[PDB]
Structure 1
Amino acid sequence: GSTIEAGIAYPISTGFDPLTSSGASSMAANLHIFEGLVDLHPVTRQPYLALAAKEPEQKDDLTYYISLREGAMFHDGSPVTTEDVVYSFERVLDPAKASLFAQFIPFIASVTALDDNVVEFKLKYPFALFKERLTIIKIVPKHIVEAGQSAFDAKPIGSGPYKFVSATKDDRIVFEANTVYNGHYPAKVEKMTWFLLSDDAARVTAQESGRVQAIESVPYLDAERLKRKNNVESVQSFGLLFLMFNCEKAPFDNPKVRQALHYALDKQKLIDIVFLGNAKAATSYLQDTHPDYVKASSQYDYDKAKAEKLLAEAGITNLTFQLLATDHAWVKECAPLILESWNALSVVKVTLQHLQSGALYSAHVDKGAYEVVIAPGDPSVFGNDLDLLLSWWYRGDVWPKRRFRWANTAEYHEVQKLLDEAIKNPAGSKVAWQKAINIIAEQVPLYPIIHRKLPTAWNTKKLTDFQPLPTTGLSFLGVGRT
C-alpha cells in the first residue's frame, strides 16, 4: 500500500475545470487528472500520445484526423467518446463560456466527429505546432460538465492516471490511482496527497522532517541547508514577476509613466536580497536562456533620474496609488523593496496591499478595481513556443481587454497583426515576433520585472524517477515510491 506525499507551494486559487483552471496548483493537479489528445511531458516538454490512439494523420495542410485510444475511460466509468472531444474544443472556443485559453488555439476552424472513434480537425491555416498545442485542451466528460459546471469545477472528472478525491483550502488535495487508465504513464502509487503548505517555514519543515518526499518552490535561504539530506535542484524557468497596470486609469495610460516606474526599481538589490542571485532582471519578454531569446530594444536597468525625468515630462506632480500584490512568500519579500524604490521618487507615493491570488483577480483585476499590480506568472505550463508565451498575455481579450485594459490602443492592434503574421508565416516569424516584443517592451502594459530559477527539493531514497519541473507545479507522472 504505497503512497506519495508532497508539499505544494501555491494555494488553491482556481477550480479544476480546464476551461478556466489557470491557478498553478490546479494546473499541476490537472496534469494528473486529465489528458489532452497529445500531452507535453511536464519535465522534458516533449509530446506523447495520450488520448490520441496513434500519430494524427494529416490529410492535407488544413485537415487532421485523430483516433481515440481503445478502451479510454473517464473516472466515473463512462467511456471517452468522440462527442466529448468535440465538446471540449467547442466550449473553449465558445466566447459565451469565458475560457481563459482560446487564444492558445486561434488556428482551429472546426472539430467534428466522423464516428465513434475519429475526429476531424479543420484549421484556418497551416500551423506547424498543431500536435504540440493539443495538451492545452483537456478532454472533459460532456454529460458531467452539463449537469453543472461549478460542481465539475470542484470535483473534476477526467481520464488521467489519477482520480480526484477531495480538496480543502489550506489543507490538501488527494488523489487515488485510476486502475482502468491505459495510457503511457499509469499511476505508480495508490494514494497521493498534496499538502497545501504556502508558508515557507511549514513547507521546509515538512520536507526536512521527512513527512513529505518532495516540495515545490524551495525558499532560497533554505536551499543549501536542505542539500544535507535531500537533492535540491534549481532550474532556469520562464517563471516571472510581472508589473501590471490598469491602462484605462490616468496617469497609467501614459506609457511614459509606466516606463518610469520600471526604471525606478532597483532590480539588483532585489536579486541579491530576495533571490540570493537566483534570478535575472528582464532584458526581454523571454529569459536569456530561452531558445528564442532576443534582447529587447527597451531595457529598464535601475535609473532613478530617468524615472524622474520621465515623470516630469508626463506632468506628474503628486501621484498616490496603492500597489496590489499577491500573498506568496517571495512576493511579500519583494513588495517592500519595490515600494522603497517608488517611494524614493519625489512625486510618487505608494501604499501596499496583499491579497490571495484568487481574490485579487476575481474581485479586483477582472473588474478594473486596481491601478498597479505585481504578481507571479508562468504560462510555460502550457508549452514553450514563443507564440504561446506571447499569446497568454497579449493575444485576444483575456488579459489585454478584460484585465490590463490596453486593447483600446493602436499598439495593441499592431501587436495583434504581428502575432497573426508570425504563426501564419513561419519563414518570417522571428522578424514579426521581434517587432511585437519591442512594442511590448516600450509600452510595458504588463512586463516582467525578473525571471527566476525554480528550486525543487526531493528525497532520492524515497522516490523513483522524480525530476524537477522547469515550470510551476510538481509532476509525479511515471514517479514511483520506495
Structure 2
Amino acid sequence: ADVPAGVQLADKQTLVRNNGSEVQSLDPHKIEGVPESNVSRDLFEGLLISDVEGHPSPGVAEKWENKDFKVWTFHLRENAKWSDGTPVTAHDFVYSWQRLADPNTASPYASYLQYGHIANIDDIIAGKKPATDLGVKALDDHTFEVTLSEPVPYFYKLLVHPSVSPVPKSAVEKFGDKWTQPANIVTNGAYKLKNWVVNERIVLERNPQYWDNAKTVINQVTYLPISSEVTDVNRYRSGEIDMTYNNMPIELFQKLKKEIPNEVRVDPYLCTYYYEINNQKAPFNDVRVRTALKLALDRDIIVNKVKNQGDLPAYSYTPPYTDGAKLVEPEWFKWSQQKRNEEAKKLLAEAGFTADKPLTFDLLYNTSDLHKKLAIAVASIWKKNLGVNVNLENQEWKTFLDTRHQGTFDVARAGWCADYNEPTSFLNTMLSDSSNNTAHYKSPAFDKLIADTLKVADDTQRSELYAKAEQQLDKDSAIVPVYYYVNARLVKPWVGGYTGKDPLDNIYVKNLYIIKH
C-alpha cells in the first residue's frame, strides 16, 4: 500500500469484506468466478499483478522481454518466497502451468492457455500430448520462458489472472484436494490463510515472507459469504463490514445514494449481464426460439425501471468500452420494444408455439436478492410480451457454475467480467472448444473469425474481426444480452487505497489501509 503523507493510520489494521458467496475453492486451477478471484489475489501471486489502477505491473517477475511477441522471457525477483520461507522459482511456474493444462485437473480455465496460445496446448487439452510438452521452461531458478505458437502482442496482459498463479507442488502432491486447508496450504501472495469456516468466514493474515511485505498495511482481512445484498448492506451499516460485495440491493440503493453518497462507489466495469441459453438443448437449439427470447426482453425496463443503478442496456457480449472494442450496434437495438415483441412472437409462432402449447422452461440463477428480483422481472416481461412461462430456480454459487458446465439447464442468468482488457477475454469463451463455454455454443464461422485475429499483424483489422465475431454471435442469438455493468458497492470512508479506476476491479488487500476514525 502507498499511504499518503499526512494520513493518520488506525491502530488496528483489519478489514472485513463481503464476498457474495462461499467460494468454489481456494485452488487457483479449480476456480472460475469473482468471489474466488477476490480471495485468490491476496493468496497467490503470478508473474504480473495489477497496480492500484489496474495496469499490468511486476508481480513475481520484476522484468520481462519478448521476441516477436512469440517468446516471452520473465526475470523473477530473487526474494520472491512462499509462506513457508522457500523460494518461488520458475520451476513452480512450469509445474503450475502444466497442471493447469492437464485434462486430469479439469480446470474451468484450462483454455486460458489456448487464449494465450502457449505452444502445444491444443494437443495437451485433447489428451494427445502429455502436459510436460507445454511450451514453458525454467531457463534457471529465476527465469521463466514462454513460447507461443503465434505472435500475441497483448500476452502479458493475461498474466494477472488466478489461473496462471503458481501452486505449491509439494503440498498439492502430499495432500491432494486438502492442500488448501489452513494446516496444509502454502501461499506466495501478501497474505496467508488463517481460518476457513464454510459458509461463515475466510480469514487471511499477513504473509511475512511476501517479498513486498514491508509495504503491506492491513494485517488481517476477513471475507464473508453473504449472498443477500440487503444483509450485506445491513452488516456494513451496523459497523461489521468495511466493504460490501459489489451486488447492490434494489430495495435500498436509491436511499443509500441519498443517505451516504460518499460511500456509494459507482465506476466503470468490464462485465456484461446476460441470460445464458443452453444452445445444445431443444428447443433452445432453434435460432428462432433464442432470437425471440433475445428480442422480447425489454432492456429499458430492466435497466431504468427495475434495477436503476446506472447500468447500460446491452446489445453484445463484449462490453463496447473494452480496450479494442469498436462494435456495430445491431438494428434491432434501435427498434421500438413493440417492434421487437412482434418479431419475437412471429418467430416463436414459426417455431411451433401456441397459446395451447406455449414455451415453458427454467430460469436458473445463483441465490441472490438482486438476481431474484431481475429474474422475476424478466419472467413477467417474457410472459407479457411473448407468452412464455418460466420456472425460476435458485442454486448456491458453486452448484450453479457446475450446473452450467454440465449443461443441465435451459436458461441461466449470467455475468462475465474481463480477465484482461481486450475483446478476446470475452470472445474466446464462445469458441467451440473453450473450457469457459457454458453457453454450449459451437460455431465454425465464429471460431474462424477469432482465429483470424492473430493471423493479421494489424490492430484495426483486428477490431473489425471482433466486431464481425460479435455480429455472428448476435445473428445466432447465442445469448440474451441485458446490460453492461457498472461497479456499485459501498466502501467505508476510512478504507484508503481503493480508487475505483480499475475497470477489471482486481483489488489487492495489500494495497489498502485503514485511516484512523
Between 1:297-306 and 1:201-210, the stretch displaced more is: 297-306
Q: Is the 8 A contact 1:418 1:432 kept in 2?
A: yes
Count of residue pairs brought into register by the alignment = 470
Q: Is the 8 A contact 1:296 1:441 kept in 2?
A: no
Between 1:327-336 and 1:299-308, the stretch displaced more is: 299-308
Q: 1:35-434 alignment to 2 at 5 Å?
A: 35-41=45-51, 43-53=52-62, 55-106=63-114, 107-109=117-119, 110-136=135-161, 137-155=164-182, 156-183=185-212, 186-217=215-246, 218-219=248-249, 221-222=252-253, 224-225=255-256, 228-229=259-260, 230-291=262-323, 292-297=325-330, 299-300=332-333, 302=337, 303-317=340-354, 318=357, 319-344=359-384, 348-362=388-402, 364-378=403-417, 380=418, 382-394=419-431, 396-400=433-437, 403-407=438-442, 412-427=443-458, 428-434=461-467
Q: Is the 8 A contact 1:82 1:116 kept in 2?
A: yes
CA distance in 2, matches of 1:177, 1:346: 54
Q: Secondary structure, in 3 states, of the residue corresponding to 1:7?
A: strand
Q: Is the 8 A contact 1:165 1:175 kept in 2?
A: yes
Counterparts in 2 of 1:390 and 1:63: CA distance versus 1, 3 Å = same
* 5+ residue gaps, structure 2: 1-10, 120-134
Aligned equivalent of 1:3, options 7, 10, 13: 13
CA distance in 1, matches of 2:254, 2:389: 35
Letter in 1 for 2:370: W
Counterparts in 2 of 1:269 and 1:9: CA distance versus 1, 3 Å = farther
Q: Secondary structure, in 3 states, of the residue corresponding to 2:93?
A: helix
CA distance in 2, matches of 1:171, 1:198: 12
CA distance in 1, matches of 2:55, 2:85: 29
CA distance in 1, matches of 2:342, 2:22: 41
Q: Secondary structure, in 3 states, of the residue corresponding to 2:453?
A: helix
- For residue 224 of structure 1, report the CA deviation from its aligned partner: 4.8
CA distance in 2, matches of 1:225, 1:479: 24
Letter in 2 for 1:365: R
Structure-1-length-normalised TM-score: 0.90
Letter in 2 for 1:391: N
CA distance in 2, matches of 1:451, 1:16: 28
Q: Secondary structure, in 3 states, of the residue corresponding to 2:509?
A: coil
Q: Is the 8 A contact 2:293 2:480 kept in 1?
A: no
CA distance in 2, matches of 1:148, 1:425: 46
Q: Is the 8 A contact 1:161 1:178 kept in 2?
A: yes
Letter in 2 for 1:247: N
Counterparts in 2 of 1:2 and 1:277: CA distance versus 1, 3 Å = closer
Letter in 2 for 1:22: E
Q: Secondary structure, in 3 states, of the residue corresponding to 1:132?
A: helix
Counterparts in 2 of 1:299 and 1:13: CA distance versus 1, 3 Å = farther
Letter in 2 for 1:83: H
Q: Is the 8 A contact 1:161 1:177 kept in 2?
A: yes
Counterparts in 2 of 1:298 and 1:174: CA distance versus 1, 3 Å = farther
Letter in 2 for 1:470: P
- For residue 99 of structure 1, report the CA deviation from its aligned partner: 1.7
**CA deviations over 1:122-169 (Å, ceiling 9, x no partner):** 111111112211222101111112224421355553211111222223
Counterparts in 2 of 1:361 and 1:478: CA distance versus 1, 3 Å = closer
Q: Secondary structure, in 3 states, of the residue corresponding to 2:174?
A: coil
Counterparts in 2 of 1:350 and 1:61: CA distance versus 1, 3 Å = closer
CA distance in 2, matches of 1:376, 1:285: 10
- For residue 345 of structure 1, report the CA deviation from its aligned partner: 5.1
Counterparts in 2 of 1:9 and 1:268: CA distance versus 1, 3 Å = farther
Structure-2-length-normalised TM-score: 0.84
- For residue 61 of structure 1, report the CA deviation from its aligned partner: 4.6
CA distance in 2, matches of 1:353, 1:182: 46
* 5+ residue gaps, structure 1: none
Q: Is the 8 A contact 1:284 1:293 kept in 2?
A: no
- For residue 196 of structure 1, report the CA deviation from its aligned partner: 2.7
- For residue 471 of structure 1, report the CA deviation from its aligned partner: 4.2
- For residue 357 of structure 1, report the CA deviation from its aligned partner: 2.1
Counterparts in 2 of 1:277 and 1:190: CA distance versus 1, 3 Å = closer
Q: Is the 8 A contact 1:66 1:118 kept in 2?
A: yes
Q: Is the 8 A contact 1:64 1:121 kept in 2?
A: yes
Q: Is the 8 A contact 2:430 2:436 kept in 1?
A: yes
Letter in 2 for 1:271: V
Q: Is the 8 A contact 1:283 1:295 kept in 2?
A: no
Q: Is the 8 A contact 1:7 1:196 kept in 2?
A: no
Counterparts in 2 of 1:32 and 1:415: CA distance versus 1, 3 Å = same
- For residue 50 of structure 1, report the CA deviation from its aligned partner: 0.8
Letter in 1 for 2:212: G
